[PDB]
Design a protein around this ligand. Sequence first.
Ligand SMILES: [Mg+2]
Lengths: 121, 119, 149, 50, 153, 203
Amino acid sequence: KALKVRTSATFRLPKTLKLARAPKYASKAVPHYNRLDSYKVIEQPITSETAMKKVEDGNILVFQVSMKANKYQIKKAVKELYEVDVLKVNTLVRPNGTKKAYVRLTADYDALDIANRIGYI
Amino acid sequence: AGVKAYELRTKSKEQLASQLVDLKKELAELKVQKLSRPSLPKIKTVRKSIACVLTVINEQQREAVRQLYKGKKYQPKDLRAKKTRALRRALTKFEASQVTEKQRKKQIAFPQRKYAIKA
Amino acid sequence: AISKNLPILKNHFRKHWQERVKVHFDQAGKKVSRRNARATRAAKIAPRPLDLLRPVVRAPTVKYNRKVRAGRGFTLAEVKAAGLTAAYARTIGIAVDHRRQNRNQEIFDANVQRLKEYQSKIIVFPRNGKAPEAEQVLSAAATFPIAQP
Amino acid sequence: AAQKSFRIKQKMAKAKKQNRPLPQWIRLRTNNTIRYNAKRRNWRRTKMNI
Amino acid sequence: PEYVRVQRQKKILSIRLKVPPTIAQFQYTLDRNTAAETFKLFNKYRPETAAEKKERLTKEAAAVAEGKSKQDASPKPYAVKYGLNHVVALIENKKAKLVLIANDVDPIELVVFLPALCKKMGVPYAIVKGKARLGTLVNQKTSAVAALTEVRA
Amino acid sequence: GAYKYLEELQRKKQSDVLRFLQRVRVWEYRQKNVIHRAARPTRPDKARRLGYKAKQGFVIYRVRVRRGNRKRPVPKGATYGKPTNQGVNELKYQRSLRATAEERVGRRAANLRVLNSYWVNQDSTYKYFEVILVDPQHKAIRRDARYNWICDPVHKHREARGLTATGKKSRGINKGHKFNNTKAGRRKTWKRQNTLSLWRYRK
RNA sequence: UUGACCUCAAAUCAGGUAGGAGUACCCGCUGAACUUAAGCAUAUCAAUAAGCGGAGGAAAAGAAACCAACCGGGAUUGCCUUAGUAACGGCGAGUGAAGCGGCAAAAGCUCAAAUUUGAAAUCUGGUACCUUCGGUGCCCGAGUUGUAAUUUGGAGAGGG
RNA sequence: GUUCUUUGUAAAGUGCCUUCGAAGAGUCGAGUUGUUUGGGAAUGCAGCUCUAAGUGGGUGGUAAAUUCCAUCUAAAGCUAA
RNA sequence: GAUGGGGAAGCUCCGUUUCAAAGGCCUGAUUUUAUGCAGGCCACCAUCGAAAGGGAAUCCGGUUAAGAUUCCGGAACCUGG
Ligand SMILES: [Mg+2]
């Protein structure tokens, strides 16, 4: 019989059908709940005098935030927990090892009105 | 005080989830009061109640998965037994009691007799 | 070094001999545990006499061939002359040695006679039923002593 | 340094939290043998070596 | 790739070297016409498959249930014999009538003694192409030998 | 029975048929890797005499090792000691090439158990062995009471502890007056006859 | 053209397994020198320390290619003894077992090499059901380049 | 000890006659080299070279030739105290 | 400095594109549709290595006890969609 024509001197590995996994049993069998939800990303507010100066002057809430949370999670959870639209989030890591978040709210909401609704003033 | 596990066990999973989120709301409301008050020992009861609710939810889900995988080989590894790595790798009782048919014929023909010696 | 009129000593203590010193402090406790092991073995084999029957046999060298002693097991020729198979003898408690031979008729006759007395003295239970309990003795060697001819 | 890594800042935070005297109610407990913070560290006297 | 290169250069080397006559006692295989008609003869005597064996045993069990024949309701089989130790014992017992040896056994030392043994014991042998052909004759993958020991009239 | 024909043919290694076959196969084995899987035993009679059975869970690898002495691995031949220990070149390894071959095969397949090994070929540079291995997790070896003893954990790395046939040969484990140094273990006997035994009532 | 076989691959293919720790005791490899010889090189320290590989509750060894030379013994291990002996050794310093005897504990065994050839009788896996350390049915596959039964030299096999 | 299944037209053992009786190879062994041992014209181990037999082979502690005798059965494997 | 390989009794050593069957890229085609099958293109061949080398893009004014090209007010720019 005739052989297959090859226009290249290189021989490559042929393409093989690669199946997907169909396991007989589940890996962990109970999916974990939300590791980092809204109640875990927001621990407590900071109520020092420097922070309390910001809540009428800058319209900025100050929260202590878990170290695993980023600005998207902070913004989403502030919107979910307090039903407030936020303008921006600026975070830092304090020298004691915790994380502090300055959340500046939109102009429609008043952080002074929201702080004593939460329960601190 | 707190919640009791035996009375938590009679509820469904949605009621347990709702009780969990009200417990978390209460924990946040106590944490915002801890900074103003000197001492607040009521936080520990809410924390242990949250732990109790999570334990009951996890045990309900795990028992449901056990009954889903009931009566078949290849159940998940965290559901099957733990004991030790060596005891899991050891031969089962059937494989250890496997004997050749030649030895079985010899054992049936000549077993160890029971005998006594005085008369 | 060498000194007054004394014998020449050979004390082999030039290695780290203090690393290998075995002092048998556990002689008494080892004896107690050994008796415990004998008693629990006897309770485990509760009718059987704790040791097999050994043949009488002639000691090897010219220093010791004047004496007779106990062997490992009976010859297949001896158990065939006694009138029972080797497998059955091993199950009823007779030590069988497949690798010793009979070249001495007196030793052969003594071992055949010893097997005859053992078969007269034992009681073999049925494999299934009543088990007529029979108050074990603990030493077939003591019930069949080795006698110098 | 000003440009530091997070591992170094984490260890610095832990040592800052450890830098405190003894809580004064510890001495009032029964069978208390603790008199003072024996593991106290100052930046002038000994270095962290991290 | 190297497996292609090894499997080509190996059969290159096996004819570059002067082979000693016990090898190249092979490679004069049977011609294709006589090979076709001897496989046509051997195809009539094929060992029983698993399903027809199973219904044969059900018929035998029913027959010993009804009439208690000593497993002799079924007639005498007529099948090709296969398996190397089996056919060597048949050749040594002079029971084989015709022996076919595959030409491509990959330890060749499994079958180099077979033509000399067949010549000494007087059994007619043929070196034939295809251990796969012998295997599909005896319902295996590879058979490496075949033998007719007793044929119908 | 073809196996005794295969044996007594295999003893004629300088017959022309075997040296031609050896000459082809040694090239074929140089062209492959140092350790590679053999599909079937080259000598099935030798494999089944050493204990192989053609069932699922019996594995054959092929292996080549470098021949010759063991050069003492010291920089520039300096030994830093007494002149009795200044030898570098003519020193010999105490284990066999078969032993180090099956030990490398066991390290390659640590999930298997080494049963035996046999010589297949050699040249000036390499010696060629085939190693029989048995899978102690396969159910055909978990069952089949003739072979489930290999699943006991005391048989992990028998070739590394010297418990195979060539391992016991190299350790000297044999009955007799020629093996008084090495009969129950050389270091065990050395400790036994270098121990000082003192009783409670001193003898 | 189509369908096999052999060999070699690829898959986040189905299910498994190895690594590391500990390391007193155990099985091996590798391997010194200080020291002693009133110096020192063979020797000794020492077939040791350090280094490397590999196990278990013990490990290893173990049912003779044994010991013997007798009226013979009879797997292995350990203790008492043989014995600071036979022997080795700049025959210097030094080193140095084993047989028998008494005792503790005692236990024996199985593959390869045989034609089932009037029926591969054998086995993994998947699936369904069940009483689930597994069983039954069915289906692929492994396997004749040999899986079961039969025998292990003390024997044993085929006939009568 | 008490009870249920009958395993199983299965398996095993024993006596006499007859024909047999398969038993492991780059191994055993030999030379040489190194190491080791109480082992001494070479105790074991290992490298290289040579390389068997089948009334054969090994051992029998002084090398070698010749004639005997004794005792085991290697080069595959499991196993409590 | 892994892998493929080759040494080493071994801890590990060599080598970094090598005696390797070493991969991904866009258009789409199909609209049981998922992403295989229509196609076609390409052969580097891990990765780590600069807070002074290369490099997308922000300035001014004000503000604190202690922060700012980062906050506030104003005015811009870049990247991805
Ligand atoms: Mg070398």
